[PDB]
Structure formats: structure tokens, C-alpha cells
Design a protein around this ligand. Structure first.
Ligand SMILES: Nc1ncnc2c1ncn2[C@@H]1O[C@H](COP(=O)(O)OP(=O)(O)OP(=O)(O)O)[C@@H](O)[C@H]1O
Ligand SMILES: Nc1ncnc2c1ncn2[C@@H]1O[C@H](COP(=O)(O)OP(=O)(O)OP(=O)(O)O)[C@@H](O)[C@H]1O
Ligand SMILES: Nc1ncnc2c1ncn2[C@@H]1O[C@H](COP(=O)(O)OP(=O)(O)OP(=O)(O)O)[C@@H](O)[C@H]1O
Ligand SMILES: [Mg+2]
Ligand SMILES: [Mg+2]
Lengths: 257, 165, 14, 257, 257, 14
């Protein structure tokens, strides 16, 4: 069924090279060669996790016939109230080697062995504020011991955690911030999203003045909402046999937000 | 209350022909995420099962731990019995032997390789490894194997089969 | 411009 | 004894289709296919928990002789001050999976393995505000990691808890609200309850103006009160050898509330 | 419907360049470069708040790829009994940072960090007399510590509050005063409003003596009343099919004030 | 002279 094929697509995910994303990739590269640690901050729906993920994938791990994989970038995400053991365990799994059973000092010794030899240039920690305050001792330790850049990614709260300790604030003083959509940038996005993500047969033509008012109020500049809203509108719309997104169905969706 | 018309269950695996016990139990623990003590606990047979993973079998508790455990792994006592050497024969211990040539067919370990008399594979016609050819380390129990990768020297394990014979 | 599917990157992964 | 059979019936429980209930079932279905998380809000006697049950039962779990089941909808209720360990344990039990002692990270790894493979599309969490603030990290994690819609069900306080954290507010921004009975809807309900639930041989003829006045003042539009009150009135009334509900016996019951 | 288009227009809001407004814009600019604090005073319907917005909008925030917006002018309006935390909270939100839980010293230290880096030259506080007396300590502190001009806007009551404290009166001694319309200025305004805001086909000749008497008594020179009254008069008048504002219909409206 | 719509100034804001 043609309709079923299309609904499954719309329910999925994709990466669109937005203006905000291009900047981060170049900034991190600077930091990568310079081998310096830094942090990235911004509001929770700005798409920080995605920009950082897209980056990870542009540097495929490499493999020769003999030695272990060389893995320039490591991306991990902690659990809530992450302890010192939990951080090493995830780094070790990420790199495909598993050590089971021992004490904290053993996970640490083993983490430094897999981080060495195997080239690692950058470690990215998502939701950095899930880290328990003491774990930063182990994050600094690695950052200073090995020539590995460490990047901390998070919301404004992350800085509230960092500013409570001078030892950390100073290693991670440099920062980049993500912002929101506005003005001409919000409009250009909307148009890209229509052609690049929705793809209905009949042009729904949203950049029109009358329609942008609806979207602006509904989304308030967060790329997160903009995506959810236009996808929910094409899916609802197709389920009812329409060939485009109109004004009333868009309002029907926006009303629920 | 919880959902209707279901029964208690766990994730099951199928044995391969010739598969060894230590190996089998390891797959099982991995599929279901648990400790050997854990298996022994669901089972109610004590801590005794952990040395099975490194091949120590003083007994054949055929009607005790072994008849009983079928109910957890969903494999009958006889198929399970077959995962150990017949009383009186076999009984090798320290080196763990392997024929990587068969790994192209199925990752596994074949228990026949640990009977005292073996040094060759007849099915693939060749010298059996008793030690790693590259890093020259002995191997870890089948029971603790991961993804068909060598920690000492990563390779495809299967990729090693062109060499040594 | 190139645009990527989200699962594709995983299918082509190192 | 005929009378005893009848008293036992009245003492029990049943589900009556109502408009409130139908609305939810269709709304959730939209959300299920779209795979989007949401929340349901409303006062505590509107019958939210019951609508959720009625929903669960419309999708029979399936089972083959050997492999694991397919369970499209999972419904759980937390205990007060629910922690991260308590949530995983209840998810794992609701599927009749055998598990025992281990640490929090171990229940977490297990929760993702039983949620995977086993078809699960939606998770519904009742009494949602019993969750401790940190557990929401685990609720978001699942919602983002697995294609599972999570529905939070609760009273106005639920939103007071949610607004304390921007990370949660945004995943669960869309909502549906349950309301109270009024006007013709309260009147039609009363009538349904007489024909579909009470069933006395004597015919009550409740919808009468002088009787609805009694019930309206007594119940103030809550379906909860309406049910208890008419059932207490038929049971008391039968025990006294009457064949119908009159005005005085109804007032005798209502006076106690 | 032609008439509906017109009613919606009249129902709305606009900003008309006027002498009072231009005067302020130039005065503030002097103060902005000089970096000096001051206050703006005048009666409640002179249109103080509107001139201030008209000013804000002529200086749009600027944005680079990485760092926070550069924001030359910040405009805030306090709630009643505004405390020290309420002032910092609004300054911080205005610049689009999220405020999290902490104590008073934290809001203060954080406010000074976002006021730095982000170029800020002027802070405008509307309805300044909603401030609690102690908060003025924090308003002076900023004005003296950072090269930021602070402008206090308000009615004659503001000065009655300010004279209660020498320390404040003296930092904010300079002021500009808004007045009322009269003579030729009131007459020219009326005419501007007719041609620039009302635009009925007929041309109502308000600047005629017979109409100015009505408006003068009705409005007493406040730009606020003048606008409300002529808009209520054109809207009522159109609904009745007339294309100009006559004597009786204007008196009908004026009598209600 | 130019006169501005009040909601337009809002829409054009930074
Ligand atoms: N380049 C992009 N293309 C399409 N969608 C995007 C893009 N960047 C972000 N998104 C949207 O953001 C969502 C992914 O999460 P997001 O990028 O907000 O991570 P995040 O901002 O780090 O979240 P949080 O900070 O709350 O953990 C997706 O639902 C997607 O619609
Ligand atoms: N569809 C229905 N059919 C029959 N009875 C119903 C129905 N919906 C609600 N009720 C009545 O409501 C009661 C169930 O509790 P109800 O859903 O009203 O409160 P609740 O929302 O579960 O409370 P809380 O949200 O505080 O847990 C039952 O006693 C039942 O008589
Ligand atoms: N330049 C202008 N263009 C259009 N309308 C104006 C203008 N100036 C003032 N007004 C009218 O006056 C009103 C704005 O009043 P405003 O709040 O700016 O004065 P205020 O003295 O600050 O009032 P308050 O002291 O109560 O805050 C608007 O409703 C508007 O109709
Ligand atoms: Mg993220
Ligand atoms: Mg309930």
C-alpha cells in the first residue's frame, strides 16, 4: 500500500545540514587539532545532540590488517547520578572491549590502556550534568594525562554545576553556544523542511505570510517543535487522503501544543 | 494487575551440534544478562555451577542439577548430558584448543577438542591451535568469549583461518 | 545538498 | 436466594462506554502510530484510570509456543516516591519475566532488552506524579532511545511537577484533558446507568426532574460519586424488600456524603 | 467583506511619529553614548511606554555565529512588590538565558556575567515604582559598576517614592518630562490622525472649530484619549454605513467618557 | 510619512 509506505517514512528521522550545525563542526575541528577541551551550551530543543552526533559520523573509525582500530572520536552519554565506575565502563564498551569484574581502580587502569595505543583525539560527553560532582576528577585526569580533547555538552544548568568548582571551571573555560531560529533564518528553514523532509506531491507552500504566523506562534523558534509540528501535520493529513498540508489541519495540530 | 494469558519466561538459545557445556551456559548468561550465581539462584542448585564454566566436573548430577536445569534453559536432560564427555573418557584441562577453520560455519567451540588425545582436526585436516599464533597467549574459557574477537590481538578470528595448519 | 537518513549512517558504520 | 445473587452483582464493577472514554481511545491511537509521547490530565474522580484499562484490553498480547510475546501496550502504576529501581522492576514484572537481585544499572540494561524484541509501542504511567524527580531521566531515555510513546496520566499537580524541569516539559508538551459531567450529558449518563448498570425489576424513572436535582447536588458532576451513590441506593433499597429506588431512600444515602 | 477588513484594521495598534516621541529618542541617545542614567516622567496617558518601545525597536540585537547576541538596549517591566531576585530574573530572561535554582548571591553574580560580554549600553525600567525600596541598591550598583545607563520611567508618584532616599535621587536627578497637547499642537495631531490613522473616504474635517470643541472637552490633551475616542467613533460609525465622523456620533461616544 | 503597524514591528524583531 502506497499510503503505508509513506507513513512509515514520515515517522522516521534525518539530518539536515542547517546553518547552526555547520558552525559547530568547524569549531570542534579547531579544537581537535589544537587538542583543547571546551564545552557546548544551549537550550534543550536546539538540537545539540544531533549536531554532535552528525559530527561523530563524519570520521569513520579506521582499520589496518594488524593493530586495533584507530578511533579519533568517542561519543558517550551518561546515566543519571553517573558514578566514577560508570564512566569508565561506558568508555570501555564504546571501544568494543569488555572487562568484567574488578574494583574502581581496575576500571581506571584499563581505560587508560584502551585510550592509549588506539588513537583517540576527542571525547564528547552528552548531558554532562548527569555526572556526579566527584567524577569530574576522573574527567580532568584523562584530559590532562592523555592528549585528548574533552567536550562537555549541556544546558544552562551545566554551568551552574561547573562554577561550583574552580578546578573544573578552568580546564573547561572556553565555550560555544547554540541559539534559536529567528527572522529570515526561521523562514529559510521552514522552506527547506518542506522540500527536504515532507515531500508531498502538491506543494503546500508554507513560507507564505499567512502560514508562517501559525508556525511562529506554535514553535517559538525551537527547531524541535518545528520538526514535530510539520511531520504531525503531513501524517494526519495523509491519513485523511489529502494531497497537501492546508491551513485548517495545521491549526488543528498547533492547537494541541 | 499484570497482563493476561502469559506465563513466566526468559530468552532461549539453541545448541549447535557438538557444542560444549561451558560454552552453552555462557551464551545463555549473555542472552539473559545474568551471573552464574543468578542462574544457580533461579535454579535453586547453589553456587556449584560457576566452576562448570571453567570445566571442573567432579560429578554428573544427572538427576539433580542437570535434570533440574532443563526447566530453565529449555533443553532436556539428555541433550544436555551430551555436552559433557562420557564417563571415563576425554578429560583435558589447561590449554584450550581451537580450530578456527570451522568458525566460517558457525562461531562455536566443539567439545571434542578437549579430550586428552587430540592434536589435529580431521574435518578441516590440520594442526589444532593450543595457543594463539600471533600474540602467543593461551585462550580464555569458551564460557567467557565475546564477539569472536581477540583481545590480545584483534582480528576476525575467522580471518585467522588462512594461516596455521 | 546532501541530506542523510538517520539510520543509514548506522548501516554504513565502521 | 434470588436476593443474594443480586446483591453480589451490585457489589461489583463494570465498564460503561461513555463519550469521555471514546475520545481518549481515538486520541491515543493517533499518538501510537505517530509514536509521540503526551500526557493526560484531569481531576481525580473523572475515571482516567478506568479509561486506560478499557484501552489496554482492546489489544490482546500474542504468544507462540517458544519465543517471547508481542505486547503493544504496557500499563504500570508507581508507588509513592518511586525511584529508578522501582520503575524498571515494574516494567519487567508486567511482562511476566523472571528476575531477582542486581544493581540499578543492571535493571536498566535488562529493561531495554525486554522492551526490545518484544513489540512494545506504548508505555502508560499512572499516578505519574509519584515519580521522584530523577526518574524522569530514565523515562526520557526510553522515550528517545526506543520507538515507544510514553503517556503520563495524572491530576493538576502533575503539571506543577513537570514545569520544574524544562527537559521534561518539552518532551511531554502535548496533552488531553478529561472533564466533568454536565447538563444533558449528566442526564443521559444517569439514564444509561439505570438501564445498563442497576437493572431493578421495578423501573426507577430517575431522569425525573426532582430526582436529578437530588443527584446533581449530591454528585457535582463526578462520575465517581454518581456511581457510588446509585449503587449504595440500590443495595440498601433491596435489602429492605423494595422493588425500586424512591426519593426518600436516595436522600437518606446522599445525606451521608 | 470590505467592511470586515476595515473593522479589523481599526481594532488594532500603530505608532505615529510625533514630536514628543522624536524628542525622547534624541535625548536618550545623548544619554546612551554619554553613559549616564536618568529618568522619564509624565502623566499616565502621555504615551511614555510606547515611545520607549519605539526606541527599542530601532536598535536590533546583533548576532554572530557563536557568541551571545549583542544587545545595546534592554527593556523590562517589573511585577508588583518586585524583589531583588525578580529584577535579576527578568534581566537574565530578557537576554535569553534560563534561570535555575540558587540563592540571591547567585542571581547577582550571574546577572553581572550576562551583562558583560554581551554588549549592553542601556537598561530601561518601566513603572519603576513597582520596585521594592531595597532593590534600588542593586540598580545603583549596576549603573556605577558597569558602563550601563539606567533609565527610570514613571508617573509623579515615582518621584514621591524617590525623594524618600537621597542616595537614589542623586544618581537619577536628570529627567525629561512628557506633557499634554494644546493649541496648534493638539489641532495638527488631530489632523494627522485623521489622514494617517482613520482614512475614511469622506474626510471628516475634525480640525474645524465645531469638532475640535467636542474633542478638546473629551480628551483634555492626552494622546491616549484622543486615540481611543476617534477609533471608537470611526468603528461605530462604519457599522452604521457612514463614511465620515459627524457631530452627533462623536458626541454619542464622548458622552460615555 | 511612515507610520508603523505595531504587530509588524514585533514580527521584524531580533
Ligand atoms: N539538523 C536537524 N535536522 C532535523 N531535525 C533536527 C536537526 N537538529 C535537531 N533536530 C530536531 O531535534 C530533535 C533531536 O534532539 P535535539 O537535537 O533537540 O537534541 P538536544 O537539543 O541535545 O536535546 P536535549 O538538549 O533536550 O537533550 C529531533 O526530534 C529533530 O527533529
Ligand atoms: N467507563 C466507566 N464505567 C463504569 N464506571 C466508571 C467508568 N469510568 C469511571 N467509573 C467509576 O469511577 C471509579 C474509578 O475511579 P475513577 O477513574 O473515577 O478515579 P481515578 O481517576 O482512577 O482516580 P485517580 O486518578 O485519583 O487515581 C469506579 O468506581 C467507577 O464506578
Ligand atoms: N505615538 C503613538 N501612536 C499611537 N498611539 C499612541 C502613541 N502614543 C500614545 N498612544 C496611545 O496611548 C496609549 C499608550 O499609552 P502608554 O502606556 O504608552 O502611556 P503611559 O503614560 O506609559 O501609560 P501608563 O503610565 O499607564 O503606563 C495607546 O493605547 C495609544 O493609543
Ligand atoms: Mg540531547
Ligand atoms: Mg486514576
Amino acid at each position: 500500500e502506497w499510503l503505508q509506505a509513506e507513513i512509515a517514512r514520515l515517522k522516521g528521522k534525518s539530518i539536515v545540514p542547517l546553518q547552526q550545525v555547520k558552525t559547530l563542526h568547524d569549531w570542534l575541528d579547531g579544537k581537535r587539532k589544537a587538542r583543547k577541551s571546551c564545552r557546548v551550551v544551549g537550550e534543550s530543543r536546539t538540537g545539540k545532540t544531533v549536531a554532535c552526533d552528525a559530527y561523530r559520523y563524519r570520521h569513520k573509525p579506521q582499520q589496518e590488517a594488524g593493530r586495533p582500530p584507530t578511533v579519533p572520536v568517542v561519543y558517550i552519554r551518561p546515566h543519571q547520578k553517573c558514578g566514577p565506575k560508570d564512566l569508565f565502563k561506558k568508555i570501555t564498551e564504546y571501544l568494543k572491549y569488555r572487562v568484567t569484574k574488578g574494583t574502581v581502580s581496575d576500571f581506571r587502569d584499563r581505560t587508560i590502556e584502551v585510550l592509549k595505543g588506539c588513537g583517540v583525539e576527542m571525547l564528547i560527553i552528552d548531558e554532562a550534568d548527569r555526572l556526579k560532582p566527584e567524577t569530574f576528577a576522573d574527567v580532568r585526569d584523562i584530559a590532562e594525562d592523555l592528549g585528548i580533547a574533552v567536550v562537555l555538552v549541556g544546558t544552562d544548568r551545566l554551568d551552574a554545576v561547573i562554577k561550583r568548582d574552580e578546578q573544573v571551571l578552568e580546564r573547561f573555560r572556553a565555550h560555544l553556544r547554540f541559539g534559536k531560529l529567528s527572522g529570515e533564518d526561521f523562514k529559510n528553514t521552514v522552506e527547506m523542511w518542506e522540500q527536504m523532509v515532507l515531500k508531498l506531491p502538491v506543494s503546500s507552500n508554507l513560507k507564505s505570510k499567512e502560514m508562517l504566523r501559525i508556525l511562529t506562534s506554535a514553535t517559538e523558534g525551537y527547531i524541535g517543535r518545528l520538526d514535530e509540528i510539520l511531520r504531525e501535520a503531513a501524517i494526519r493529513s495523509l491519513s485523511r487522503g489529502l494531497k497537501k498540508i492546508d491551513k485548517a489541519v495545521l491549526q488543528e495540530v498547533a492547537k494541541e501544543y | 494487575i499484570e497482563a493476561p494469558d502469559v506465563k513466566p519466561w526468559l530468552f532461549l538459545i539453541k545448541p549447535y551440534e557438538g557444542e560444549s557445556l561451558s560454552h552453552f551456559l555462557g551464551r545463555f548468561r549473555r542472552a539473559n544478562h545474568l551471573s552464574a550465581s543468578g542462574l544457580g539462584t533461579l535454579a535453586g542448585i547453589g553456587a556449584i555451577v560457576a566452576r562448570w564454566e571453567r570445566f571442573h566436573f567432579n560429578p554428573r548430577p544427572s538427576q539433580q542439577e542437570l535434570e533440574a536445569i532443563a526447566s530453565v534453559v529449555e533443553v532436556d536432560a539428555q541433550r544436555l548430558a551430551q555436552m559433557l564427555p562420557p564417563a571415563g573418557v576425554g578429560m583435558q584441562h589447561e590449554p584450550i584448543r581451537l580450530c578456527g577453520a570451522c568458525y566460517a560455519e558457525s562461531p562455536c567451540h566443539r567439545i571434542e577438542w578437549q579430550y586428552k588425545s587430540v592434536w589435529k582436526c580431521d574435518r578441516h585436516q590440520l594442526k589444532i591451535l593450543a595457543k594463539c599464533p600471533n600474540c602467543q597467549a593461551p585462550f580464555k574459557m569458551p564460557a567467557l568469549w565475546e564477539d569472536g574477537c581477540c583481545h590480545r590481538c584483534r582480528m576476525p578470528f575467522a580471518e585467522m583461518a588462512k594461516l596455521q595448519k | 545538498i546532501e541530506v542523510w537518513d538517520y539510520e543509514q549512517l548506522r548501516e554504513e558504520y565502521g
